[PDB]
């Protein structure tokens, strides 16, 4: 829902964008254990997110500055629900980054200096990782340079090519197909959507449409010709989340995080996500870290 509806505000006509709706949703779900009143209500998110440890590794940590008083029932509630304890940290010192990166591995995304100010009093961090082969891999020796038509500009991409039997179907509103490429686990899979107008697909995407796709795709023998790709995206989601109704969390006057803190001085300034996806003949490697303030 909010996670999936956020993509329409980061989608780019002129660029390659990758995003993790799950990573956003998981972060907001933690943020919700700290909120109360209207602020919590606007964080409209499942209270429990799915987790499956073979299909993808997911991680959730909260770094609160050691000055900040936390209600003991919040850290108890936090620890009991996410099998992890709030990490008290000093957000002004110089090795705070070192402490936090040195903490995430074991159990390192240092592309988070974008998100640490010196007045930062909390860091809510959601990490998503997936590395999995295709069920039926492509053969690299048949991958060839082929053209890619973006409006009137044309590119030379490394295009993969295989024959495989997969679920597929055509659809309208504005003509496109959807094809399911299963990974070797077979609980995760890639839906590939090839349209005559991408921006129209973006403005329509939602979970109903996705389940519709899954019901109406039919097995068939296919030729799949698709590029290898590697994309990294650093996204600022504050504007999108506000447009999706999450407003109180950002407003210092109105932000109720009183379930976490008797301070009444904890609010969200930034929501940042850096994601990277890599697809090639052998499978897919995907990564996403969402940082709230």
């Amino acid at each position: 829902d909010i996670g999936l509806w956020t993509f329409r505000y980061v989608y780019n006509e002129s660029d390659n964008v990758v995003f993790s709706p799950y990573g956003l949703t998981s972060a907001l779900s933690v943020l919700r254990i700290a909120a109360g009143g209207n602020t919590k209500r606007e964080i409209d998110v499942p209270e429990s997110v799915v987790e499956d440890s073979d299909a993808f590794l997911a991680l959730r940590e909260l770094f609160v500055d050691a000055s900040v008083p936390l209600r003991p029932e919040f850290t108890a509630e936090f620890s009991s629900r996410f099998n992890t304890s709030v990490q008290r940290v000093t957000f002004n010192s110089e090795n705070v980054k070192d402490v936090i990166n040195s903490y995430v591995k074991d159990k390192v995304p240092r592309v988070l200096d974008a998100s640490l100010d010196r007045d930062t009093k909390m860091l809510l961090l959601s990490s998503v990782r997936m590395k999995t082969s295709w069920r039926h891999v492509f053969d690299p020796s048949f991958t060839t340079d082929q053209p890619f038509y973006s409006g009137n500009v044309t590119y030379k991409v490394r295009m993969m090519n295989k024959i495989d039997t997969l679920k597929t179907e055509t659809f309208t509103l504005v003509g496109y197909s959807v094809t399911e490429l299963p990974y070797k686990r077979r609980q995760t899979a890639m839906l590939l959507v090839v349209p005559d107008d991408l921006g129209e697909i973006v403005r329509a995407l939602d979970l109903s449409l996705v389940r519709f796709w899954i019901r109406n795709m039919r097995k068939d023998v296919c030729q799949v010709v698709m590029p290898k790709f590697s994309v990294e995206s650093v996204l600022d989601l504050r504007d999108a989340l506000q447009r999706l109704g999450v407003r109180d969390a950002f407003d210092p006057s109105r932000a109720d995080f009183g379930q976490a803190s008797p301070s009444n001085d904890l609010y969200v300034t930034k929501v940042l996500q850096t994601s990277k996806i890599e697809a090639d003949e052998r499978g897919t490697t995907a990564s996403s870290d969402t940082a709230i303030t």
Binding site: L4, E13, S14, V157, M190, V193, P227
Partner: protein, 38 residues
Amino acid sequence: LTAIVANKPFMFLIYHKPTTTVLFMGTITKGEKVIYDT
């Protein structure tokens, strides 16, 4: 035979089948090396 050719801007969704949860998404509108022709 049925031919799927992603040689124009497209969308991908990486989702968890048991729970129908979208893990990753992206749109791909461009390559790196620009090409010209006659």
